Design a protein around this nucleic acid. Sequence first.
RNA 1: CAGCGAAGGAUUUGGUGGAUUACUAGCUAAUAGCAAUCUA
Lengths: 431, 48, 28, 276, 385, 445
Amino acid sequence: SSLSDQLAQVASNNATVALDRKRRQKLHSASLIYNSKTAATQDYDFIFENASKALEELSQIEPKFAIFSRTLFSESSISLDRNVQTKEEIKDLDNAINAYLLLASSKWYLAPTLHATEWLVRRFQIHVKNTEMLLLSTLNYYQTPVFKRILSIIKLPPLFNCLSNFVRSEKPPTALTMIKLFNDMDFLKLYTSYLDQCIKHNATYTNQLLFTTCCFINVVAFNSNNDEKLNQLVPILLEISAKLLASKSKDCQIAAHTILVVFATALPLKKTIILAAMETILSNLDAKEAKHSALLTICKLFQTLKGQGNVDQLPSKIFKLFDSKFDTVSILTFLDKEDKPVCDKFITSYTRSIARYDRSKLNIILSLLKKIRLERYEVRLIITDLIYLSEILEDKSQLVELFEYFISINEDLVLKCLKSLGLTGELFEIR
Amino acid sequence: DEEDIALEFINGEKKDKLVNMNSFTSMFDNIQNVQMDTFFDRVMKVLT
Amino acid sequence: PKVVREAKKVEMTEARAYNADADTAKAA
Amino acid sequence: DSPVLQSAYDPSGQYLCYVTVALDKQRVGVQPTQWNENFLYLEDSKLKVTCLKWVNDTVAIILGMNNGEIWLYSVLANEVTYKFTTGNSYEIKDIDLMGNQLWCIDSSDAFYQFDLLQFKLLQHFRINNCVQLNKLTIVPAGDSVAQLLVASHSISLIDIEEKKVVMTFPGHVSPVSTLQVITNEFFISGAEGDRFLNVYDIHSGMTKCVLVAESDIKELSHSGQADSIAVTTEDGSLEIFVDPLVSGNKSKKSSKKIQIVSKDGRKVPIYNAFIN
Amino acid sequence: KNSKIFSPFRIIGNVSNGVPFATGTLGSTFYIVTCVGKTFQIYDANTLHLLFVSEKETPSSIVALSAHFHYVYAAYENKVGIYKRGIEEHLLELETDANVEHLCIFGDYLCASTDDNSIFIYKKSDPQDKYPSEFYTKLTVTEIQGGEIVSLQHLATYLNKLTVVTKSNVLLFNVRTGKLVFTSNEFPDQITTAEPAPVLDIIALGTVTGEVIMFNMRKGKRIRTIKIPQSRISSLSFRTDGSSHLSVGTSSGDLIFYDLDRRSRIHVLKNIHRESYGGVTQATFLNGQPIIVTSGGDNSLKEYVFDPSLSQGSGDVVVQPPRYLRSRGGHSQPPSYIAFADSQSHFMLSASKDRSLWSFSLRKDAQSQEMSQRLHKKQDGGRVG
Amino acid sequence: EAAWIDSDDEKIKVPILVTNKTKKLRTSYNESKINGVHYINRLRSQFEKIYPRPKWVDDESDINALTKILSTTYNYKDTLSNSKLLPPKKLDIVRLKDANASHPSHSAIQSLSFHPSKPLLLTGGYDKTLRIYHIDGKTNHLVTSLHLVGSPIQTCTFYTSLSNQNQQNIFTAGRRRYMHSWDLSLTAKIEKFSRLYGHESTQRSFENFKVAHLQNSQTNSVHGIVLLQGNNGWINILHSTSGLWLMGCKIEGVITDFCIDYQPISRGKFRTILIAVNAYGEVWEFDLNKNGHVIRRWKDQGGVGITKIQVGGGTTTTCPALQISKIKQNRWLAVGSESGFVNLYDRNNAMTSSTPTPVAALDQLTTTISNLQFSPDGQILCMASRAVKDALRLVHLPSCSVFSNWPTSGTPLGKVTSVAFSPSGGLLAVGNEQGKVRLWKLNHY
RNA sequence: CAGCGAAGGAUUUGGUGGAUUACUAGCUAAUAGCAAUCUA
């Protein structure tokens, strides 16, 4: 290309190294704490000693920082220069920095981590070189003067380009701009990589997960009326949904339930992928809040299923697994909940599966059929499966009790299912 | 009776509530210091 | 301002390839 | 344009079987030629009649649909009796039968053998060096189940046992739309779009005559001994050539022309004639 | 027939036909040898100009071609022609009437295979001359040993071995002693593509159901399997610039880029080539290059470049989707009507049965470009119908 | 570790320094001919430094199934196969041939109907020439074209008897004081109903009528009814075969419109209800298989002058049944105003209310509405004005969301004055004032 | 205001790619080697 941009490239390459006094002070004056004319007279040992004090108090409030004392906040670290050593030890350096940054992603409400990280900024120059992990680790606190400060001193990466009119503006960046930051899969694959590192370090927490989930449902909201964009956007959100369920935290599990429920009501998925999602959210379900939320999200997932085969049998290994994680009386009291969420298609598939893969305890199906109301094709398919069951195994008092209940309400349904299969005289013969 | 059972099949569907691009902007007002289960209940009540 | 999705002049760098000539032999 | 999608006469010219479309569903109607109201409907819009032929002898149509089925359809019992499947879900392009044995030709260029007395698939073969293929005709020499004549865009000839091309012909610049044998040695070809039928010898391959219509051909009937060929033009007129194989020594013109105009100054376009 | 006024010259405006092309390197250049019906053509890959053509046609149509450094090995009805700079330098008549199907070049031993699982391998008279000129031996795979052949190649770092890929089995050879060495396991469906990997001694092989097996021939096992629903696979390749990327090409006109380090679809490409003309006939990475050369059966050759990543820290996880780069095409159906544009006999116009209009240039064959159907807007207020 | 041993390469020797490219993999300056397996290992390391060895080969050797199915498939929507219903907010229209194009019309298109089973469209306008087309997706022609002088027709429709289905009577009416019936028999015999038996002082016009079946309910003489409008509050129900005044019903306030809702009673019995509105917008819902006396009455939530009421979902005028057992209870009601606000009501809970709240009260088209009709299956609502161009909207329901993708501004609707559906085909037909009727179809049906 | 009028119309502008001369492949120490290397 041309000469001007051809060496603007090498200027951006060697922006980290100070070449004289003017660029040295224009590089040293970046700070998370002090302003320019104060920060231009600090030395390294001063900010190092107050940062080490900040670190040791931060390490007694969180016991996983003495390793960074031993290897990154040591006394030789003030002499360790970054851009004087080879690519392999700079790779060691910035993955250690990334470890520290995701570890200290939580603590940004309290000033010890500000004074702990400001020496890291001033010495290892993460505000120019290691900028990405810094931004998308502290992205949760976007209404805070720490984020306004760090965005005022940052050099802005090519991904976060929507924020470049929020540098040195007193207005914090707004939620709409955060959505427009999140609204391309070049950013989203990056952010899912970061969340994968947070999962496999268990550095997840209730505020980062809340913010992440809220921006993801807002991204799906903006891509509601773009079918090609939504189908383009599936295999990353569902990917970290499945990676989010693999962890142990109740909060990330119910965040996975949140993105799953909003995505299922966003677009109609297929039966095989929604069944894999159902068994996946069941296969790592431990805490009671996760039980409650997973039951709600399973019911809504199955409610947003259309086309034929919607109310069919869930198979045996997902059915017994659902019964292993959820006993029948939990289903009964959830149906006894007074809010009455619409769960008719899931309860229809549950009735057909308990009548086909257990065929033993029909007090359950009679009780919950009394407890909810249910629509006509659902009860037609239930009583068809009941006709087949009543002819394969011999009739019982429970079976004929629910049968005469379906006599007592809406006779011509079971009459027309007998017209499809036999005759009411033959059914009274099998009575 | 096949179109009759098809017509009953399409009759047996209630009013869902769709999503649209300005339905979830209100969550950002109370993303602060809120337990995620209450967030899940909030997004489900704004959803249905 | 959107993210600058921007192309560039592309250039074919140096090849570096195994060749099959050293894969045969002969009885001596 | 004609609201009849396609039509075909029974042999000896007494009945017409015609496929029309009626509220995005094709239906097949039969009609005698001196009311009948047994419209066989089709199921859905993704299922339309590509080609059809009478049989002769419980009276029946066979209808090649556009998915890989041949609906052998009786006319008396107003339903499809038998459903000749193929292995592929490919739309067929022509059917032709002789006695028991029946040939079908796919869009994936395969040739299919069927037998309407025993309802099996006998054999199944694609061949090289002929790709766009849309209609065939079995060449009769009594019981010549071998040597059928395949045609699109350059007419080929196929023995069914050596299974190679035995003789190619100068086709047309368009795909072939009519391919009718007329004697034991001559056959009419005619493409779509063009006014120019041509009789080819089936042994030497030399064009004997070129029949010149005055508009685009749509269909044609011929007498049993090829002494008279009536074609129906695209603009609804009719051109009947008398004695086409006797010699205007190379390109025979239209001998007689028939149109059906009303007394109101309105021409109604005829189509699908039949001459015995 | 021969003539006495007009002599035929060249069939212009024609790029590919559907035969899998080949590629060759010269220094740090790349040339693409594609087939057009009977003659072939040699493009370069940097600016995608034409460079060479065969100086005279073949008897039959070319069924298979490959390319070493300077030389192009064409293969038609019974022979293999060793060519240099588009000029035929040596015929090689095979010792049969059987039609040749595939071939490979490695070291000294050329190896071609007919349509009855018979493999003529040839050898250079002097281990210093330029091309294999002398018949060495004739292997023959029998139906006990596997199915009927579908490819063959010598994957790397193998001392005078070879890999024949059948429809049911993989089977090696030691081509010096003419010996089979290792038949592989059984494979339960028809495989149709096999391309080697730039990692040590494994070969990726894709089936008629959409799975890619990765056979490790030294181990004799399979390492991984990429499953894909009901895709008639056609052409695999690997990317060799360090960052490992597999690339499958499905005959439904699809091009799927798989990562292999984390088994993820990087990006799909839909309807890149037309479905009905064969789909992706052959697609390959240029080695040491982050570009893709695809060619369909629909008279089109394309190049797709992978951009550098936008995540300067993350890097290999965030991969930018492939751009579109240079491409050369003609219309894919026989041309209906033909005119000459200028008096200088430089430009000519075609309009084809696939309803496209092209301005071919018979002077220099990178100037030919399609005319564009973008309506001038009605500046009186009307709307385009 | 190798599953095979070549047993030939170990007895080979190669002088590696014969050429340039094979002389760098020496290790001393005195070694010339090396053994075969050593040679294999040397060039194998040369290959591994000429392309590095990545991790995915030495990874492995082939709560998970979500990742597995997600890495399997591409199209993440089930709607390719069955779909059984509509997709909301984006429908699959296509265009067909303009249904007036064979034999055009001259006046507006004030009425447009379909034969209930046969593939026939009827067109009727103020130029007093009721035409009938045979319609199809390619080229659709005129079967017959009755003209009748001195009677500019306003509304006209097909009718078949429920009992023996072989009647096929057109009914047509305009601003005059006579209407016409027609038994269609492929030269026509038409009768002119003008005998008003009971009430003769309430019709300045016949220009609004419906046709509806009813049962006898002591016998089963299922037969037709013409329902004509009057002037004060009068709507008169006649006979369709004979022409006898069956009875009449007056509501309080000026009639604006009315509709007919059937409901089954047993296997072979059914009951008809007439729904009528004011301009004020309090409706009367009275059965008329017994004598016409009000069995329900309630009030629309709003409207100053409401213009058009249409019931749908089950069977109705536009989607009629053929066998008597094939008749179905409706689901949706719709009421439309001069302000444009169309309320749509469910009728599975709102037989109990006596003041029902709307399911939705939509407003997208601004001006007054003129025609609104449901689908034959009750998933599309179709609303249209007679005031401005492109004044038609389509509403997916039960979700009650307007379709966004259609109609755009570039659709050639014209100033719409009538609209109708197919009974089965999902083939929609719109008519304007400048003469042409255009034809679309819905690809889900 | 009108009409034109297939699930939008009409404009501003960046970047890349292809042309703007007539298409015989790259490098070097060049009757050859290289393309993994010109070194002993």
